[PDB]
């Protein structure tokens, strides 16, 4: 409503933190995924609609700041693999985007706001039961994978 009519395209980021190195089978890299409590329990990384103001990465950088309380300054956009995430949910497709994205704050607090009660680091299989969505699932597997290249090596 004050956020514009309905939502057309949202963004977020894909949220993930590398360990030093991997331990029994929890990769050292996880992925930040948020459960709703004020809908119907579903989990999801950080990401909202975009208003008819701000921009696509920017909202996405806002709801990573905000759904999850992770601000763009302690996350660097690692960005390589993005592309618009498009998922219907129960039954609404609305466009969302997806950055990479690392906290280089190994104990960054997520804070919640309004919107989100549950966060949780997880690895790749354990981020893709929680995802649900077969775009997570291969956004977070896809995004894994330009992590290679990364400083995951």
Avoid at 21 to 30: G, H, L, M, R
Avoid at 32 to 49: E, F, M, N, R, V
Avoid at 127 to 143: D, I
Wanted: with cysteine; aromatic share 8%.
């Amino acid at each position: 409503g004050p956020l514009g009519s309905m939502a057309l395209r949202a963004c977020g980021l894909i949220i993930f933190r590398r360990c030093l190195i991997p331990k029994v089978d929890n990769n050292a890299i996880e992925f930040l995924l948020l459960q709703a409590s004020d809908g119907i329990h579903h989990w999801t990384p950080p990401k909202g609609h975009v208003e008819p103001g701000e921009d696509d990465l920017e909202t996405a950088l806002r709801a990573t700041q905000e759904e999850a309380g992770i601000e763009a300054g302690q996350l660097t956009i690692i960005e390589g693999f993005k592309r618009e995430l498009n998922y219907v949910a129960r039954n609404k497709p609305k466009t969302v985007i997806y950055w990479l994205a690392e906290v280089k704050d190994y104990d960054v607090e997520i804070r919640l706001s309004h919107e989100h009660q549950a966060y949780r680091w997880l690895g790749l299989e354990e981020a893709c039961q929680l995802a649900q969505f077969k775009e997570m699932k291969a956004a977070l597997q896809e995004g894994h994978q330009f992590l290679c290249s990364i400083e995951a090596l």
